[PDB]
Amino acid sequence: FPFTLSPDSTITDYLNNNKFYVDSIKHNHGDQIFELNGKGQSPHTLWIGCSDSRAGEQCLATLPGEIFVHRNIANIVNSNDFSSQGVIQFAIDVLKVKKIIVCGHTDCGGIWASLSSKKIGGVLDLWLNPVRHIRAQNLKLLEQYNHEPKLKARKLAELNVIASVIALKRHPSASTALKQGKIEVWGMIYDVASGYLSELEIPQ
Amino acid sequence: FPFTLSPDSTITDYLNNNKFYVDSIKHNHGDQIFELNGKGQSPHTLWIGCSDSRAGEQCLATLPGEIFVHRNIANIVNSNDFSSQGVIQFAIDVLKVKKIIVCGHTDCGGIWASLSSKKIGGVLDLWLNPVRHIRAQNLKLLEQYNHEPKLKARKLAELNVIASVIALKRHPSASTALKQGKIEVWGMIYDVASGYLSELEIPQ
Ligand SMILES: CC(=O)Nc1nnc(S(N)(=O)=O)s1
Ligand SMILES: CC(=O)Nc1nnc(S(N)(=O)=O)s1
Ligand SMILES: [Zn+2]
Ligand SMILES: [Zn+2]
């Protein structure tokens, strides 16, 4: 009801809110935006975030052709995952992006699951292992957040974003581009209960 | 630049765009949306589309908390990829999504890249192999359209979307959920030069 679509929504329902979209841009910006999207893309930023339906890059309200997006569970950058590492290769080599964002978010069930032992099944257990490694690397800290669980999940969330950062900093194309200074990289948290973005201090 | 941001944009410019984004949803919907998001997420759709800066789910004009998203290069579903297969497991088994969408698009360079004889390099060459294997699998058809490559790409991008759809139906959860009729799956194309979506027939 409050959301724009519903599970009962018919195919044409979806296409209607698409017809809107098209209409909305053609009013605020005319045909210029779509003439450029058809010619080519020159995005200034690549977004690496979690697949959560609330933490999408929509939180930056951008026109198409501006943000290169990659989204998976728990916004993890695994060096041994050809999906992410391949995106980085293209974002830097060909498009020459000028800013890379990796964004976790509050209420990331992928984090709350990592703090649990209850096996999940299928690939998720293995896919979430890189965060479990953080849970162990920083328990001496995390154990203190016992009676305050919400703060526990937030801290591990930030650490996961920090880990995903250092992982992307070690990518050859990213490493070669930083030392030259032609790229910036930021870490951020999307607060799901407020819509605001918070930058994360990144250690060296 | 008619775009909202610019490659020279500072960090402060990104926050303002976010602050804006927050203002719109509150103005038009109050604190309601971010109060629901703050509690949890119950999206109705799984979006699996290319990562292109122009083919993002924003072409549905949806609010946060509606679309569980995953995006990679060329919108490919390979049963040997942890990230994607893990998203499919979570979307159907837990979130109990009602409809899934696989969306290629036009001018998808990953398709055009698979239409050249030279290698790309890095980890990208072997990420695109599923597409190249489809170009080979259907050259009887790709043997036409050589008159105009634009039409050829439109067909391969199509075929790629299709293939990704059946591979998705091969997921255990997906196979189980579809047989029970507890879920739908659609295949679409996002025409980048006009912003309209186009449904694609998906055979058996
Ligand atoms: C097993 C697992 O990953 N659990 C999930 N819970 N929430 C998720 S989210 N915020 O990435 O959509 S994933
Ligand atoms: C040129 C190449 O190697 N492929 C890419 N071209 N477009 C891509 S996109 N639209 O999926 O981001 S990837
Ligand atoms: Zn998450
Ligand atoms: Zn593409």
Residue numbers in the entry:
A (entry chain A), B (entry chain B): 32 to 235
From the paper:
Fungal carbonic anhydrases (CAs) are metalloenzymes that catalyze the reversible hydration of carbon dioxide and play an essential role in fungal adaptation to environments with fluctuating CO2 concentrations. The opportunistic pathogen Candida parapsilosis expresses a single β-class CA, CpNce103p, which is structurally distinct from human α-class CAs and therefore may represent a promising antifungal target. Mass photometry and X-ray crystallography revealed that CpNce103p forms a stable homotetramer, similar to its homolog CaNce103p from C. albicans.
However, only the Δ42 construct, which fully excludes the predicted disordered region and C-terminal tail, yielded well-diffracting crystals. The crystal structure of CpNce103p in complex with acetazolamide (AZM) reveals a homotetramer organized as a dimer of dimers. Each monomer in the tetramer is bound to one AZM molecule (one inhibitor per active site), yielding a fully occupied tetramer with four bound inhibitors. In the AZM-bound CpNce103p structure, Zn2+ is tetrahedrally coordinated by Cys81A, His136A, Cys139A, and the sulfonamide nitrogen of AZM. Key contributions include His136A and Asp83A from chain A, and Gln72B and Phe121B from chain B. AZM forms several hydrogen bonds. Its sulfonamide NH− group donates an H-bond to Asp83A, while one sulfonyl oxygen accepts an H-bond from Gln72B. The other sulfonyl oxygen interacts with the backbone NH groups of Ala105A and Gly141A. Hydrophobic and aromatic interactions further reinforce binding. The thiadiazole ring of AZM engages in a π–π stacking interaction with Phe121B from the adjacent subunit (∼3.8 Å), while surrounding nonpolar residues form additional van der Waals contacts. The C-terminus of CpNce103p is disordered in our structure: no density corresponding to an expected helix (often labeled “α12” in homologous structures) was observed.
